[PDB]
Amino acid sequence: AVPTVVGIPDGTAVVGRSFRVSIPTDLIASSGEIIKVSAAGKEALPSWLHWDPHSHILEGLPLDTDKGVHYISVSAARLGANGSHVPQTSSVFSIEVYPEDHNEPQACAADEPVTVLMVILDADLTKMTPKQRIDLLNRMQSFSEVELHNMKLVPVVNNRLFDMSAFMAGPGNAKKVVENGALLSWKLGCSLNQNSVPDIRGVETPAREGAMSAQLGYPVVGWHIANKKPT
Ligand SMILES: [Cl-]
């Protein structure tokens, strides 16, 4: 037998945006071999990533503290008669986490503020696993009508649970805010105003009635729509 070498291409991620890539385990593991996916030189993955061994998906949602380059090892091992894991091969690639998505899914003119809908949640992303972060985005899709990968999810900063610049807004179900808070947002369009915003009853009504929080799994503090400086 002559060993095969598999190269995996490097990836990119953006703070506050879902990350998902397929790992070619069928090329790396000959039949009956055990796959391990970890940070290079460690047993665990970085805190922002999760490995699904049955779908062969590496997925995550980075925070600002995850900015920079993450080396990931994908290795295959033979289980010995004595239960030992005998390493057979390893493939290492990196993922660079960038700081800013500029509220753009990818489309607005550089002359143009982005109209963003934001939902404020009583949650702490730093207390949530990567899978919990992704599941929260998944559960917002019924309300946003935006795909998982086009929503943004970041912590509240400097304890601000409101945006005075918002030209539309409304309440959620929460009466108290126990955690630091999280901001889950998406783009509605470019330099919109109240008359050109789409129908948002599908956000505002479930938010106030508690149906949104019951689906998301976290209390909803409120929602607002504001135009944000282009970047
Ligand atoms: Cl940010």
Residue numbers in the entry: 58 to 163, 179 to 303
Publication text:
Dystroglycan (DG) is composed of two subunits, α and β, that are formed from a unique precursor which undergoes a proteolytic event within the endoplasmic reticulum during the first steps of its maturation pathway. DG represents a widely expressed adhesion complex that plays a crucial role in offering stability to tissues, being at the crossroad between cytoskeleton, plasma membrane and the surrounding extracellular matrix. The DG main role is to bind with high-affinity laminins that are central organizers of the molecular network behind specialized basement membranes surrounding skeletal muscle. We have pioneered studies on α-DG at the molecular level, having extensively characterized the structure of its N-terminal domain, which is shaped in two subdomains.
Interestingly, the human T192M mutation (and its topological murine counterpart, T190M, which causes a similar dystrophic phenotype in a mouse model), lies within the strand B1 that together with the strands B2, B3, B4 and B5, arranged in an anti-parallel topology, defines the floor of the basket shaped S6-like domain. The crystal structure of T190M has been determined and refined up to a resolution of 1.6 Å. The overall structure of T190M does not show global differences with respect to WT. As reported for WT, the structure of T190M consists of two domains: the first one described as an Ig-like domain (residues 60–158) and the second one (residues 180–303) similar to the small subunit ribosomal protein S6. Despite showing very similar crystal structures, WT and T190M differ in the conformation of the flexible loop linking the two domains (residues 159–179). Moreover, in T190M the loop could be traced for three additional residues, up to Gln163, with respect to the WT structure, with residues (158–161) assuming a β-Turn structure. Despite the limited effect of the Thr to Met mutation on the neighboring residues, the introduction of a bulkier and apolar group such as the methylthio group of the methionine causes a re-organization of the surrounding water molecules. The lack of WAT304 in T190M is rather interesting, as this water molecule bridges together the B1 and B5 β-strands by interacting with the backbone of residues Val188 (O) and His296 (O), and with the side chains of residues Thr190 (Oγ1) and His296 (Nδ1). WAT304 acts as hydrogen bonds donor towards residues Val188 (O) and His296 (O) and as hydrogen bonds acceptor from Thr190 (Oγ1) and His296 (Nδ1). Such hydrogen bonds are not observed in T190M due to the lack of a bridging solvent molecule that would stabilize the interaction between the B1 and B5 β-strands. The plot of the emission spectra peaks as a function of GdnHCl reveals a cooperative unfolding behaviour for both WT and T190M, with transition midpoints (Gdn50%, i.e. the denaturant concentration inducing 50% of the total peak shift) of 1.45M and 1M, respectively, indicating that WT is more stable than T190M.
